[PDB]
Amino acid sequence: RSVRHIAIPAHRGLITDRNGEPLAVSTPVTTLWANPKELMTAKERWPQLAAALGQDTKLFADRIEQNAEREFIYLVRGLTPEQGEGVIALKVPGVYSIEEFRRFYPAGEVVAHAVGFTDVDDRGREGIELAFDEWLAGVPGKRQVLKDRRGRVIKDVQVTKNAKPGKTLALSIDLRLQYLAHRELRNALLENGAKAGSLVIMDVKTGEILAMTNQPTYNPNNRRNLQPAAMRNRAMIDVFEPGSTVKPFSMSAALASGRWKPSDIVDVYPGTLQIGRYTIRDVSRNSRQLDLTGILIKSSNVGISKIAFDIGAESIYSVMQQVGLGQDTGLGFPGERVGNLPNHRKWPKAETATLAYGYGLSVTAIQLAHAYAALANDGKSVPLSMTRVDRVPDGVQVISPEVASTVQGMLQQVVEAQGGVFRAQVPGYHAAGKSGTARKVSVGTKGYRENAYRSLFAGFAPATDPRIAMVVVIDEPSKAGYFGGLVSAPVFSKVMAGALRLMNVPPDNLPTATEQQQVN
Numbered sequence: 001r002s003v004r005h006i007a008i009p010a011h012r013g014l015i016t017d018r019n020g021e022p023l024a025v026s027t028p029v030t031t032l033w034a035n036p037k038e039l040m041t042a043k044e045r046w047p048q049l050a051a052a053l054g055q056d057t058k059l060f061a062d063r064i065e066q067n068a069e070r071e072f073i074y075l076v077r078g079l080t081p082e083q084g085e086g087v088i089a090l091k092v093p094g095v096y097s098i099e100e101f102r103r104f105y106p107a108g109e110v111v112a113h114a115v116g117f118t119d120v121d122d123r124g125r126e127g128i129e130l131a132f133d134e135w136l137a138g139v140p141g142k143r144q145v146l147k148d149r150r151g152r153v154i155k156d157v158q159v160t161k162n163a164k165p166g167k168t169l170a171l172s173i174d175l176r177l178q179y180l181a182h183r184e185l186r187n188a189l190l191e192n193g194a195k196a197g198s199l200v201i202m203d204v205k206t207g208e209i210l211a212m213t214n215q216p217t218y219n220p221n222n223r224r225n226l227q228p229a230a231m232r233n234r235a236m237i238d239v240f241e242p243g244s245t246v247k248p249f250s251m252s253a254a255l256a257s258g259r260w261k262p263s264d265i266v267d268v269y270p271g272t273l274q275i276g277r278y279t280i281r282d283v284s285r286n287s288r289q290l291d292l293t294g295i296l297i298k299s300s301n302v303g304i305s306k307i308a309f310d311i312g313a314e315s316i317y318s319v320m321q322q323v324g325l326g327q328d329t330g331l332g333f334p335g336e337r338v339g340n341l342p343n344h345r346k347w348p349k350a351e352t353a354t355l356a357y358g359y360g361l362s363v364t365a366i367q368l369a370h371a372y373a374a375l376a377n378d379g380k381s382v383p384l385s386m387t388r389v390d391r392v393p394d395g396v397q398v399i400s401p402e403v404a405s406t407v408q409g410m411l412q413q414v415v416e417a418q419g420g421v422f423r424a425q426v427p428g429y430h431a432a433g434k435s436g437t438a439r440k441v442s443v444g445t446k447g448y449r450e451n452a453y454r455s456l457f458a459g460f461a462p463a464t465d466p467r468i469a470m471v472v473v474i475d476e477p478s479k480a481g482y483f484g485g486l487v488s489a490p491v492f493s494k495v496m497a498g499a500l501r502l503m504n505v506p507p508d509n510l511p512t513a514t515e516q517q518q519v520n
């Protein structure tokens with residue numbers, strides 16, 4: 001004969017996308033418990049109770065009997081409010097209901113990496129759920145119940161503490177763009193028989209991350225056979241050598257140096273440059289001299305290396321650091337990597353060249369998209385955000401307007417010119433960007449793999465007023481080639497097209513426009 005204090009569950013804060021679409025919601029559920037002492041006096045009600053709980057008659061009876069001594073045991077957790085009230089309507093002595101919450105994720109695996117999930121005890125363990133756990137959580141209340149000798153609840157005596165709900169959090173992500181990106185990366189992953197992939201979409205004016213998806217993914221609503229590898233928000237927490245996708249930045253350093261201009265011709269014959277023991281190679285060996293634009297179009301390692309030798313590595317390091325490569329994003333996503341921008345006291349030729357064409361440094365997809373955002377935004381870099389921004393934040397002019405404008409023009413040519421990356425063309429829009437392909441690092445030794453690759457494409461659109469930047473990374477494609485401009489480019493094409501239409505961006509290239517775009 002005494003008083004027990006029992007918890008009152010608190011509503012966990014609603015997570016929404018930028019426009020209010022629910023991404024994580026605490027849904028009301030009903031838990032049924034029983035006092036075996038009471039149930040032992042109504043044994044004749046058991047078979048009906050067992051059948052309403054979908055449980056074997058004897059196994060149910062066994063459960064109650066071996067707990068006859070106890071005053072509390074769970075019957076079933078997480079019924080619907082209707083299902084629980086269906087069993088309560090039976091009026092079985094000793095059977096009680098308590099209303100709890102289940103965390104539900106409406107978009108499931110589409111946004112699992114960004115949103116993350118809570119555990120059995122309602123604490124965030126991954127993604128945004130972990131990052132904003134304090135904001136989201138809220139605080140359970142307490143109430144007192146009176147129980148008799150046998151443990152029968154006879155009275156709800158008082159509330160000693162009210163439950164307070166957690167706070168709503170609006171993510172920067174646009175769920176429409178998330179669905180599109182998710183589906184297209186998946187399709188790409190499956191078409192190409194890739195092992196993994198990431199896709200990031202960024203608003204270049206505001207810094208908001210509009211979409212961030214990875215493969216493999218998982219269903220946070222059903223984690224039964226979850227494996228660790230599927231949990232990774234790779235766009236944020238995995239690092240890679242960006243390869244030729246950093247060339248527009250090497251190029252920006254070159255134009256910033258006052259030593260180079262777009263018309264300058266670099267001689268690249270015969271597509272190799274031996275420097276001591278190390279040998280720089282071009283995969284395209286069809287041209288023997290290229291202007292600055294042609295170095296990007298042909299993606300000449302040799303061309304960019306000779307430029308790098310002239311301007312020096314510190315020039316290139318600087319722009320790369322300024323556009324945030326290898327730097328802290330300030331996002332605070334759990335597990336997020338800063339990457340690495342190597343810094344030697346003395347820069348040999350080897351390290352100077354490889355940096356210039358994107359090796360010996362490591363970035364994340366997020367960082368790469370952020371760097372292209374700055375270039376896309378006329379050289380103004382804007383702070384990354386994974387929450388909705390109200391005011392457009394102040395930027396930092398990291399590349400001059402003129403140089404950014406010139407490098408924009410060149411990247412538009414990388415996509416639109418003959419010999420360029422034509423699979424990256426966006427119907428109805430002028431797009432700009434740069435493909436890349438990187439040999440994966442050897443497993444168990446230093447060096448590069450013979451037959452495993454990472455396909456990259458980074459870019460932005462519309463060229464005439466860039467609105468969004470996008471990075472597509474695909475690991476180990478094995479079925480339809482491996483080059484960036486073959487694997488990742490068509491994904492950029494499709495997602496960029498869909499994204500721009502979804503955001504109502506008017507088309508700037510009507511010659512190539514779609515069915516209804518040509519009507520408006």
Ligand SMILES: CCN1CCN(C(=O)N[C@@H](C(=O)N[C@H](C(=O)O)[C@H]2N[C@@H](C(=O)O)C(C)(C)S2)c2ccccc2)C(=O)C1=O
Nearest residue numbers: 243244283299354359435436437438439448483484485486
């Ligand atoms: C530091 C040592 N070390 C590390 C490894 N390593 C590379 O893995 N190199 C890349 C490479 O050069 N890729 C090119 C690029 O992106 O520019 C190609 N990508 C295509 C595309 O994006 O479609 C292209 C536009 C047709 S050219 C390569 C070479 C051969 C096959 C696949 C990939 C080096 O080079 C290198 O010296």
Ligand SMILES: [Cl-]
Nearest residue numbers: 261262263264
């Ligand atoms: Cl010029």
